[PDB]
Amino acid sequence: MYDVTEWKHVFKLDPNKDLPDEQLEILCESGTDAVIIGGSDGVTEDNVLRMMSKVRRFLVPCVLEVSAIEAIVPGFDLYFIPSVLNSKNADWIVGMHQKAMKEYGELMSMEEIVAEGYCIANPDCKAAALTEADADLNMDDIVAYARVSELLQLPIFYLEYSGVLGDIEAVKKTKAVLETSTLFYGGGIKDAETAKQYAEHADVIVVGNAVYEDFDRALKTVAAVKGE
Amino acid sequence: MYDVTEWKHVFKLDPNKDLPDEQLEILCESGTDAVIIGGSDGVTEDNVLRMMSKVRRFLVPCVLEVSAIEAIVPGFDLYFIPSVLNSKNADWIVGMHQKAMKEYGELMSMEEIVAEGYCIANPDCKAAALTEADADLNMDDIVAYARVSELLQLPIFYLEYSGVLGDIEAVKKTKAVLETSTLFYGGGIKDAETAKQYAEHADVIVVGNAVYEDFDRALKTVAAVK
Ligand SMILES: CC(C)=CCC/C(C)=C/CC/C(C)=C/CSP(=O)(O)OP(=O)(O)O
Ligand SMILES: [Cl-]
Ligand SMILES: [Cl-]
Ligand SMILES: [Mg+2]
Ligand SMILES: [Mg+2]
């Protein structure tokens, strides 16, 4: 019953960090379309489990973006499973996913799962290092990864720039080739202005790091794209 | 595009070989559901080209299985682009797709393309060495590759054993977990009896090099199954 093609904004929270309960509550009731519990690396099941319990009470859909088999926790409304399409190591595309299925096939069949075709386009971030992504891409390299996602009919193509604003032109061209995939963009969105700019091309903008750096400023990204 | 969920039998041909006399024609007129142009130890644009000119004239859908970017040729009803799910080389999982999209994006848009999830389950064959496949798999491994296939939305999961018959129990168990894709089985089918046996679990049986070894016998695999 969760339709990402109707979404416009999502906050991505890092279970490795701590947020005041007051802020976590404010983010869940902010009007964002989803609260995603992310991770990238070093995540632990206990932090994920505490966060699940803290966000589940709210009406907003809570999503667990799976980044480690040890950190799959029941209780979330949805599960996003990333596949790093430009990874140079099969583990981040399919390998870890096969081990998870082998180990938790049953737990996996009982949840709503959505695969995300990730394209990590910032060569200098923790995510690119970890996943051995060939992240130094020209725009047509990115557009081609988007075409690959559209061909596999991955519900989500996520252009990931991490802590930097990505080339807006690459967001506009990616969007132009996606006909079924929902385009998620994440990267340097810290306020109303940037939020509004990227929301012009992405189907969904992801605001994450900013919540920890300047909370009040990051909160305005919601009204910035859903407001009057 | 042609609907593979209705198929039951397909012959897969090696564009590097040629059938004698009118055998290609009898095969394309046999009742099989599709003729797939494949090939091992790589293919060349020339053989594929020549094969395409031969099979496009018939009603049976003709499919090019794209195992090499350099051998793509326009003119087929369908193009299957494999992802070797158990490959250790990302180039066989997503790289081929990305190259085709980057180098032949406009050709890709004008053709009907189907992404197939491949699982090479025979560790002792050309395909496995060529794709660096982790092919010494137990049954629960295969079952898990099939789940990944569907997670990735692939319309086809192709369980490949090449030159030999695969464990019939593996076929039955993979058919059991696939809730939304079509199960292709390939591997050592050379006659009516074995084709019938694997057709009990697989959605589509692929009969390949048996057509060069014993044509009359491979031809009976169509009726055995349909
Ligand atoms: C275990 C399993 C079933 C599949 C493996 C899942 C995979 C491929 C995970 C890697 C996904 C990553 C690095 C996501 C970025 S979170 P982010 O956007 O917050 O970036 P950051 O944490 O700041 O590095
Ligand atoms: Cl843990
Ligand atoms: Cl005909
Ligand atoms: Mg809730
Ligand atoms: Mg024809």
Ligand 1 atom closest to the Cα of residue A12 is: 19
Tokens of B138: 């137990």
Tokens of A174: 């990616």
Rounded Cα–Cα distance for residues A63 and B200 (Å): 40
Q: Do B94 and A147 touch (CB under 8 A)?
A: no
* B143 in A contact zone (CB under 8 Å): yes
Place of tokens 């140079």: A88
B56: phi then psi, degrees, rounded to nearest 5? -65, -20
B35: phi then psi, degrees, rounded to nearest 5? -120, 120
The alpha carbon dihedral of B114, B115, B116, B118 has a sign of positive
Rounded Cα–Cα distance for residues B201 and A186 (Å): 44
The type of residue at A74 is P
Length of chain B in terms of residues written: 226
Residue numbers in the known binding site of B are 12, 14, 40, 158-163, 188, 208-209
Smallest Cα distance from A83 to chain B, Å: 9
Which structural technique was applied? X-ray
Smallest Cα distance from A140 to chain B, Å: 7
B157: phi then psi, degrees, rounded to nearest 5? -125, 125
Q: What resolution in angstroms, rounded to 1 decimal?
A: 2.0
Q: Are A27 and A11 in contact (CB under 8 A)?
A: yes
* B151 in A contact zone (CB under 8 Å): yes
* B110 in A contact zone (CB under 8 Å): no
Closest Cα to residue A9, out of A144, A174, A208, A178?
A208
* A69 in B contact zone (CB under 8 Å): no
Rounded Cα–Cα distance for residues A74 and A81 (Å): 14
Cα B29 to middle of ligand 3, angstroms: 6
- Contact residues, chain B, for A94 at CB < 8 Å: 83, 85, 93, 148, 152
CA B207 to chain CA centroid, nearest Å: 9
Q: What are the E-state strand segments in A86-203?
A: 113-120, 156-160, 182-186
* B164 in A contact zone (CB under 8 Å): no
Query: From the CA of A54, which ligand is nearest?
Result: 4
- Contact residues, chain B, for A119 at CB < 8 Å: none
Distance of CA A79 to CAs A28, A108, A221, Å? 17, 9, 24
Closest Cα to residue A145, out of B107, B152, B97?
B97
Q: Which residues contact B100 (CB under 8 A, 6 or more apart)?
A: B66, B69, B72, B81, B108
The type of residue at B16 is N
Coil vs helix vs strand at A46 = helix
Q: Are B121 and B82 in contact (CB under 8 A)?
A: no
Coil vs helix vs strand at A35 = strand
Q: Do B93 and A93 touch (CB under 8 A)?
A: yes
The number of C-beta contacts closer than 8 angstroms across A and B is 84
Query: From the CA of A53, which ligand is nearest?
Result: 4
Q: Please, what are the domains in chain B?
A: 1-226 (3.20.20.390)
- Contact residues, chain A, for B101 at CB < 8 Å: 143-145, 147-148, 151
Rounded Cα–Cα distance for residues A210 and A192 (Å): 12
The alpha carbon dihedral of A204, B102, A170, A11 has a sign of positive
Question: Given ligand 1 and candidates A35, A40, A204, which is best to mutate, with the most ligand atoms within 8 Å of its CB?
Answer: A40
Distance of CA A137 to CAs A90, A96, B226, Å? 19, 24, 49
A208 assigned binding-site residue: yes
Closest Cα to residue A198, out of A174, A215, A217?
A174
Long-range contacts at A13-18 (CB < 8 A, ≥ 24 apart): A13/A37, A13/A38, A13/A51, A13/A208, A13/A211, A14/A38, A14/A39, A14/A40, A14/A208, A14/A212, A15/A39, A15/A43, A15/A44, A15/A47, A15/A48, A15/A50, A15/A51, A15/A71, A16/A42, A16/A43, A16/A44, A16/A47, A17/A212
Rounded Cα–Cα distance for residues A205 and A228 (Å): 18
Partner residue facing A97 (CB), from B83, B148, B154: B148
* A88 in B contact zone (CB under 8 Å): yes
The type of residue at B184 is F
Ligand 1 atom closest to the Cα of residue A101 is: 3
Backbone angle region of B75, left / alpha / beta, with phi > 0 → left and psi within -120 to 50 → alpha: left
Smallest Cα distance from A32 to chain B, Å: 26
Classify residue A16 by its DSSP letter: T
